[PDB]
């Protein structure tokens, strides 16, 4: 009974391989061999953050691209100025691991979670002027990974166990449960236009879901060991999976599909965070060796090193403007680099 | 305008104040001392706790010295992901049950994973050989667990520099220093970071532990402090 | 995507020998760590044996050394236990894990009961 359900499943497989063979007609790198080449990427740190006192796990560039709130397992929450460099709220947490964080986009009110098995939410819009927590998030059995706004009313956050969650905070509950990985849910990442999200697992694959309806949509298996860091082409259209591997790797939702992969031959270890520029042209890409990279996302050519971090780079973001790249790392120094010429 | 000199002053002393926060936080931080509870399964975690909502947290000064116990218990089976953490504490305190399946092989199968992650390699460990009572009662019962699950014990014999035990069983003394070796060596196995292990053989059930623990502690500090001078 | 299927398996007598073959299609077989994780009918999985990188470092699990002996062909993509000499005890459920990332001296989590990169069942019986 159940040899038949394998076999039935291992034949779905097959015949799922055989439709992605033949929808392949021809090869990004391929089609890629006349472009113009990026060039050396020159980017030089601009400001350096040093109000953290222990590692930084997870750190969010503000709507505006202006504030960035960040984390660390010295039980601190500092919004910064990046301009500035001043630090405008420092918000002593309950529980001192904490692995993630996210600024809402209405810039009212702050994510945390991690060990607690609780997403904690501080609204920074009070009549009293203090940060106190608005709501507690309870009902994930596992360490929380990841949390990302999906408005000032909604939030989705994936959790050690293999179940994401789409929360409300006016009510306080879960709304839908997004069942069906095999591993922990290590990381997540939002569509531009809120529609969809992808939730990189711990099972070498990625599934997409559709926030109102709540089922998946699609599987891309492409990557051999664990996914640590996700992220949407700007298009909203294609994403860029982090692993284990030392090697980034481009899906295409329409393709169902890979695209081309920026493997290195001198890059051993794994890769934390994963980013793309404003145009999605540049694809950075945070290291265990310490030094963050830049891929040409169309030619998987090295353009430039964000080199200068001591411990591994744990968190990667580029401003929703696009101007400036800031990389947290276990060092705790909060870095915002920046392209001139 | 004198608008944005205005804000941008207003921002400055909330800088300065926020700063001198977490300049007091620094000291408190820096004082105290954070310690893993990682014990495989039930191995007298419970009890450990006792004597000394997924994570849980005790704030015990022995002393005059702070500590912080970390029993991480409501977590998932996996533990490659959330256990990167714990690479800043001190210590991690480890608890095997030396009386289904071979726990003790579970047991070091757990230690070496600990003792080979890279990011945990600079990170010290202290083992808590719990069930000696029940060890004792084992093998003074003729049960021939020990013996047939690890084959390499009959070719043993007691280290001669630590006995002392007054009157227990020659026969229990060589189990649990077996035990202890089997640790120690794959500990040794490595020296690939800056981190030790203090095997203890947890059998009282008095405050003993506690000092046990801040003994290891302040050795672990002396240790990390003689070698940023570069004298030892 | 691994794609981990054992082979062998079957009943045989006590004292007899067994040939199990692991077979890997999904992965750069030469940068993993493969080891071997059995689990009896009514207990835990229970690790039994692993293989390093290029084949030089071996461990077993006591009870089982000088009856199971490990290899791996890094060109055929294969993994091999040749175990001899059974015993009533030995009948399991093996399967053949394998270390979650590479390069990599260390691995947790092959020993549990929601690990994601190994094999199906491969039934063994001694009567």
């Known amino acids: 009974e159940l040899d038949q359900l394998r076999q039935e499943a291992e034949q779905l497989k097959n015949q799922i391989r055989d439709a992605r063979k033949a929808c392949a007609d021809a090869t990004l790198s391929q089609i890629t061999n006349n472009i113009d080449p990026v060039g050396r990427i020159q980017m030089r740190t601009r400001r350096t953050l040093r109000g953290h006192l222990a590692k930084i796990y997870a750190m969010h560039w503000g709507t505006d691209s202006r504030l960035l709130v960040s984390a660390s397992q010295d039980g601190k929450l500092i919004i910064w100025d990046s301009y500035t460099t001043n630090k405008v709220h420092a918000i002593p947490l309950r529980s001192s691991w904490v692995m993630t964080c996210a600024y809402a986009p209405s810039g009212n009110y702050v994510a945390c979670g991690g060990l607690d098995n609780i997403c904690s939410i501080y609204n920074l819009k009070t009549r009293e002027g203090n940060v106190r927590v608005s709501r507690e998030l309870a009902g994930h059995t596992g360490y929380l990974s990841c949390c990302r706004f999906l408005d000032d009313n909604q939030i989705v956050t994936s959790s050690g166990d293999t179940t994401c969650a789409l929360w409300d905070i006016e009510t306080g509950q879960q709304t839908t449960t997004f069942t069906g990985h095999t591993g922990d849910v290590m990381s997540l990442s939002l569509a531009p236009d809120t529609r969809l999200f992808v939730s990189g697992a711990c099972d070498a694959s990625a599934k997409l879901w559709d926030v109102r309806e709540g089922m998946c949509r699609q599987t891309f298996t492409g990557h051999e060991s664990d996914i640590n860091a996700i992220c949407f082409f700007p298009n909203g259209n294609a994403f860029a999976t982090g692993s284990d591997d030392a090697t980034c790797r481009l899906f295409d939702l329409r393709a169902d599909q890979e695209l081309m992969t920026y493997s290195h031959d001198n890059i051993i270890c794994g890769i934390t965070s994963v980013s793309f520029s404003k145009s999605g042209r540049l694809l950075l890409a945070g290291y265990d060796d310490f030094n963050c990279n830049v891929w040409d996302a169309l030619k998987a050519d090295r353009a430039g090193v964000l080199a200068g971090h001591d411990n591994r780079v744990s968190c990667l973001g580029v401003t929703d403007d696009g101007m400036a790249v800031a990389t947290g790392s276990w060092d705790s120094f909060l870095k915002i680099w920046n392209g001139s010429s | 305008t004198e608008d944005q000199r205005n804000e941008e002053k207003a921002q400055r002393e909330a800088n300065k104040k926020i700063e001198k926060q977490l300049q007091k936080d620094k000291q408190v931080y820096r004082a105290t001392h954070r310690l893993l509870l990682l014990g495989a399964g039930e191995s007298g975690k419970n009890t450990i706790v006792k004597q000394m909502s997924g994570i849980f947290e005790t704030k015990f000064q022995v002393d005059k010295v702070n500590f912080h116990m970390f029993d991480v218990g409501a977590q998932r089976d996996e533990r490659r992901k959330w256990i990167q953490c714990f690479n800043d504490v001190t210590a991690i305190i480890f608890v095997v049950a030396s009386s289904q399946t071979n726990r003790l092989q579970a047991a070091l199968k757990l230690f070496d994973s600990i003792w080979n992650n890279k990011w945990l390699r600079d990170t010290s460990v202290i083992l808590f050989l719990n069930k000696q009572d029940l060890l004792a009662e084992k093998v003074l019962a003729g049960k021939s667990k020990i013996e047939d699950y690890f084959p390499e014990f009959a070719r043993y014999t007691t280290p001669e520099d630590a006995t002392p035990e007054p009157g227990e069983d020659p026969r229990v003394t060589r189990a649990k220093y077996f035990i202890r070796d089997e640790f120690l060596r794959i500990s040794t196995a490595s020296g690939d970071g800056r981190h030790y292990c203090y095997p203890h053989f947890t059998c009282a059930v008095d405050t003993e532990n506690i000092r046990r623990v801040f003994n290891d502690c302040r050795d672990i500090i002396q240790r990390m402090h003689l070698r940023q001078y570069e004298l030892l | 995507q691994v794609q981990l299927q054992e082979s062998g398996g079957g009943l045989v007598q006590p004292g007899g020998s067994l040939r199990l073959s692991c077979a890997a299609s999904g992965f750069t077989f030469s940068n993993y760590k493969m080891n071997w994780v059995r689990q009896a009918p009514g207990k835990g999985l229970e690790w039994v044996s692993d293989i390093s990188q290029s084949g030089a470092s071996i461990s077993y699990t006591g009870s089982v050394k000088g009856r199971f002996t490990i290899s791996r062909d890094n060109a055929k993509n294969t993994l091999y236990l040749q175990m001899n000499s059974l015993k009533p005890e030995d009948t399991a459920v093996y399967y053949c894990?394998?270390?979650?990332?590479?390069?990599?001296?260390?691995?947790?989590?092959?020993?549990?009961?929601?690990?994601?990169?190994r094999g199906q069942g491969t039934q063994v019986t001694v009567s």
């Open positions: 894990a394998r270390c979650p990332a590479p390069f990599t001296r260390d691995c947790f989590d092959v020993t549990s009961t929601t690990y994601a990169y």
